[PDB]
Paper text:
The enzyme, glutamine synthetase (GS; EC 6.3.1.2, L-glutamate: ammonia ligase) plays a central role in cellular nitrogen assimilation by incorporating ammonium into glutamine, which serves as a carbon and nitrogen donor for the biosynthesis of nucleotides, amino acids and lipids. Here we describe a structural dissection of the archaeal Methanosarcina mazei (Mm) GS and its regulation. Like the Gram-positive GS, the Mm GS active sites are formed at the interface between two subunits in the hexamer and are comprised of five regions; the E flap (Mm residues 303–310), the Y loop (residues 369–377), the N loop (residues 235–247), the Y179 loop (residues 152–161) and the D50 ´ loop (residues 56-71), which is the only active site region contributed from the adjacent subunit. Like other GS dodecamers, the Mm GS dodecamer is formed by two interfaces; hexamer and inter-hexamer interfaces.
Interestingly, Mm residues 165–169 are proximal to the catalytic Y179 loop, suggesting this region could impact GS active site formation. Based on these analyses, we posited that residues 167–168 might play a role in the different oligomerization properties of these GS. To test this hypothesis, we generated a Mm GS(R167L-A168G) mutant and performed MP experiments on the mutant protein. The MP data for the mutant, performed at 75 nM, showed that, unlike the WT Mm GS, it displayed higher order oligomer species. However, the population of dodecamers in the GS(R167L-A168G) mutant was much less than we observed in the Gram-positive GS. These data were explained by a structure of the Mm GS(R167L-A168G) that we obtained at 2.45 Å resolution. The structure shows that the Mm GS(R167L-A168G) subunits are similar to the apo WT Mm GS (rmsd = 0.49 Å for 432 corresponding Cα atoms). Hence, the R167A and A168G substitutions did not result in these residues adopting the structure observed in the Gram-positive GS in which the residues inserted into the adjacent subunit. However, the GS(R167L-A168G) structure shows that the substitutions led to the formation of a tighter interface compared to WT GS. These analyses explain the intermediate impact on oligomerization observed for the GS(R167L-A168G) mutant compared to WT Mm GS and Gram-positive GS.
Author numbering:
A (entry chain A), B (entry chain A): 5 to 447
C (entry chain B): 4 to 447
Amino acid sequence: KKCTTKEDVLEAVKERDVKFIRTQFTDTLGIIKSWAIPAEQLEEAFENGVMFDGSSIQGFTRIEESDMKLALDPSTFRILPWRPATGAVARILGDVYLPDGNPFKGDPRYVLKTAIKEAEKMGFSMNVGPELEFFLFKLDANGNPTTELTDQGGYFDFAPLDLGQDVRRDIDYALEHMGFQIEASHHEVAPSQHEIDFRFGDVLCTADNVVTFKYVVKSIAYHKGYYASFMPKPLFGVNGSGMHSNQSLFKDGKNVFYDPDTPTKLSQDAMYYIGGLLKHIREFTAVTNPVVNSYKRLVPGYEAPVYISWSAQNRSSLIRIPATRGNGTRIELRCPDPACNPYLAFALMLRAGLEGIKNKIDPGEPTNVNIFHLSDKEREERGIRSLPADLKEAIDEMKGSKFVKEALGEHVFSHYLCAKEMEWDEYKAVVHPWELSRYLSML
Amino acid sequence: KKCTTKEDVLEAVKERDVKFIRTQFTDTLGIIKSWAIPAEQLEEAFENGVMFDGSSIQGFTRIEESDMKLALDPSTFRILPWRPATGAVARILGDVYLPDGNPFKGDPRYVLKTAIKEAEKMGFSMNVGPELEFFLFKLDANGNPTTELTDQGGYFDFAPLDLGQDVRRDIDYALEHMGFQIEASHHEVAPSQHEIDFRFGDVLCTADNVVTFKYVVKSIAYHKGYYASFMPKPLFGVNGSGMHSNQSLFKDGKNVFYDPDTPTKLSQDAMYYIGGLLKHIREFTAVTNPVVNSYKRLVPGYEAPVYISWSAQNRSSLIRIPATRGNGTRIELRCPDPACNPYLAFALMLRAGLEGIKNKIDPGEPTNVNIFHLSDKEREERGIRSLPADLKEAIDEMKGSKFVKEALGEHVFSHYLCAKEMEWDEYKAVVHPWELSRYLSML
Amino acid sequence: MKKCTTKEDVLEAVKERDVKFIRTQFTDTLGIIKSWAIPAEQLEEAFENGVMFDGSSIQGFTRIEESDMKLALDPSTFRILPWRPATGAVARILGDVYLPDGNPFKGDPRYVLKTAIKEAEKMGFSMNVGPELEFFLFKLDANGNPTTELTDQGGYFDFAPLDLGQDVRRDIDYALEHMGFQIEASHHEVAPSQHEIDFRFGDVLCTADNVVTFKYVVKSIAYHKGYYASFMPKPLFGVNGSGMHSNQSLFKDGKNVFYDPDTPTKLSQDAMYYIGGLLKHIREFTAVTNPVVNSYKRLVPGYEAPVYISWSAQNRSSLIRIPATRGNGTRIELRCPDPACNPYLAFALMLRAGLEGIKNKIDPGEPTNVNIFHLSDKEREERGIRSLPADLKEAIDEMKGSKFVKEALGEHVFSHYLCAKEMEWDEYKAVVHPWELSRYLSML
Ligand SMILES: [Mg+2]
Ligand SMILES: [Mg+2]
Ligand SMILES: [Mg+2]
Ligand SMILES: [Mg+2]
Ligand SMILES: [Mg+2]
Ligand SMILES: [Mg+2]
């Protein structure tokens, strides 16, 4: 089941009776985009490319069309894990080009590719294993999503044990049937919350899978009567959903972060990589935490980190070093939530870590104390800064950042910020029922 | 009906058959406070004072009691506008003292008195006429307040014309029966919204009346089946409720703001007074706009001002000069909402205006253009700043302000900020239904 | 079924039986069953290098920070679950938890039971356990949530229920036998909709693993037939609660060391000392055998649950009972625990207490052949008959100052267990219950 050439794809389409091909790409804000191609037209698509409206990539801030061409990558062909009676369905990715023949710089996948390209200039290749947390909710009588609980279980609980036990198994099976190579799946801290850990793979292939994961899990749950939610904080008072990103660099086949003779067995480049991450994380929190609801997860008192720090012992730090060493040496960034665009988030993580190695950015001493247990003046002395407290603050930090603008390009940078600003200007004017409950009788 | 001495009060209590006396004071956050005294004990109260728990003034941030004494002011005695079958009811104010005999610096009324005291050092006395906007809503089946409309009328509409016509008349009559001397009352822009304009009077007496107004209107409406709401923005998409504060200074009986020979007929001190207001308004917006809901009114596109500016022509400026001249020359600050503590708000307005005259603070050229019609870069050149966009930003501006700390005192200053911070930390973590409507199906 | 010994045994069985997912199985400090799924393709590498996982999951709801830990899979614990999804077969597997430095994690309750077994081996003893698990079978509401709605109104040993509940009850028994549980007996219990399943009398470590497996297997099977299986100690007022009677005996040289043909009761001196140690320390770890606030709504007089510390051979209502069987079947039954307890911690502490009795020759005193429930405080005080802790707070306080429980559990488990139970009690003691409104709202 390893596809390399267009002839590999075409023969598998004929042998497996694939009738529809679905393109897969994402817009600037991480929404999954697609259109359907009948398989009869697939051979022409491989030869000539497929023309489509490129403003779909631009987000919801689009006004004008832009004719663009999608050059299909046969190595991304993959059959979807459901079987219509008519025939099989498969997804395929590709690269977006302008009519003049130049690659469209506004595709988030292209943005990730340039970061991979800059990493290869120094001989580095990046591997990532994301830990994706989500909620399994009930549908109402009309089939609409709700936040109604499907179980009351806790961390690593063997739950649910009713019919929800079968949908969770169906989700894991569907991913395995598609070649995901899941490492582990388990119940998360909050009721009805679940986590699936990806295999440690190369960043580009992993990023494509994070996108595929989201609509596969969504579709499988829907067809069983449940709703899979990737909201950061759908429920007050319980754990939010993060997307922890374990990352590692390789050069000449060996792990760049590992060093057998150092006290912590962590290399100098590992320290530099953390320094770049710590130096720039505030500038692209708006990308790792892209929606207004993201910052309801980034509040003190839960697993989510709100203070910029690193440690090898405390969990609640922004960056944590797992105990694993050798070829598996990795660092874990714990702030992102599964609403982020994986292409933009992974690219900025790579660029920030690369800038740490380039500029020999010291990360400081690790914070082994639970920072939540500290006063504001204590953190002030130790130089412990915090993440932006809402989307608007994150927007302002990203607005004036030379690092983020150069890494995304002036087109992705502008369009992402403009959409997020429109988002906040809508939210900031809403009068919420909490305000009514608090002030109607008081004032 | 003019009371001057304790014997004036005691005889009127006997003649008018007053059976209960209600003390009236406010806490640090502007909530109206009270306790009941049977009229038989009133004569002892005038002689010795009344001991009460002073931590009631401290707000909801109180932990320890503090025994304090209220020295009743017989000139504030006033009979309430409803008539129980048992007997009449009256309100009375006073000054709060510590057991050692010193005035308690934490009473907001005392804070206003010191600003009046500092104004008298330069020969100034301040007169204020507040324009109080409120909403008239329906009660549900259980008598609880709602936001259900009582009319659909607009600006200056003769509405409502149903039974709501009688409660609005009852409210105006009750205030007139109590000696308020209302200037005008009319329908406001939003449906079910109403405004009552006070007589131009001295700041201390006016501030006491703003407090009395709130619970009188509340009680009169309740007993007719309606709810009077003083929320800034109870309803999205329609006008909020402000408390415009027209103010003027007098020295030697003549209006300090008037000058017959100047082009605009406005004196130099009037310009200085505006300059101090403009220089400091950002530092005490947290007092004029004290609740989270206040900044749902301070959004662009309605009558509320969000840009720091002054003009004699445009309404939508933060400070506006009415056309009236001579003894009636006044300036109007349009940002406050009726949730503010009138003692703290008027005191800071007086101090800021006084600091303008002391330091000869130029207010700049007036902005006669509708600032809302301008780009961000246009306002940048003209030095046009904006008000804080939420309660947290207003808290931070007040936290580091030497002017506000000195004018309120270190005890009111600390307690006010601590309560408002607890307020924001509760609001910032709430997951609102708007987030569910926007992100549950998307993410 | 089959018995697996090597990793090659398990890997073969995965292929020939089309097992697609392996579920790890362990417990947190409080006894909550913990698991995560491994794809069968990953299983071969799991046997070679172990599986990294967040070991703070073992701490319970008192976990402060993450802790990387390794699970070394035990091939002999591989067992196929008794449901057959269309996708493929499912199996569970246990293992040992190791720290990154290579040492075993002392906070795993399974490790705690294993060191108790090691103390028995030092004195030449191996311990066998047969538990009797009581549970309730309730209806689900219209939304699929558990209720306390009855499924039958039968009593002790009744042939009930006889409606569709007869089938789910039989499905539970069939699936346990399908996994090789070798059930001794299953019957209706005293309370309506209450049931009992009697485990095979076998090795303590294997039996403790089966108790954890039993709970989620019964719950999942009941769930899929529209019923809820409850292991609450006392879900309903006014009827019997659910207990976990723990039969036990020691063996040495393949002989039962509790049996003596020569003595009058046909019990050896070691059995007397073993009882003495149990009676000496039972108060100090009642918080382990009866771990939740609801446990002490069962530990009240009048419903078969023992509240007084005594032993006897005749009447069951004693804390410790001697069944009539002798010879190789000689055992002593401890009747205080409920199915909410962690079996690893409860069995470990029973063993340690009994072994402490043997090594210190602790006399158990005269048996109390009368029903203690018929005695005054004066009569009970005259015979020096003590009570079990009356609520979780009292049991916590008795466990907090026990040097014995701290040594047997280890510091990590000891503090983490107590801290969690204290937070549980502090939350409970502040609640204003509807019973208080019914009694006081009108009166005061
Ligand atoms: Mg997690
Ligand atoms: Mg993690
Ligand atoms: Mg108006
Ligand atoms: Mg006005
Ligand atoms: Mg029984
Ligand atoms: Mg029994």
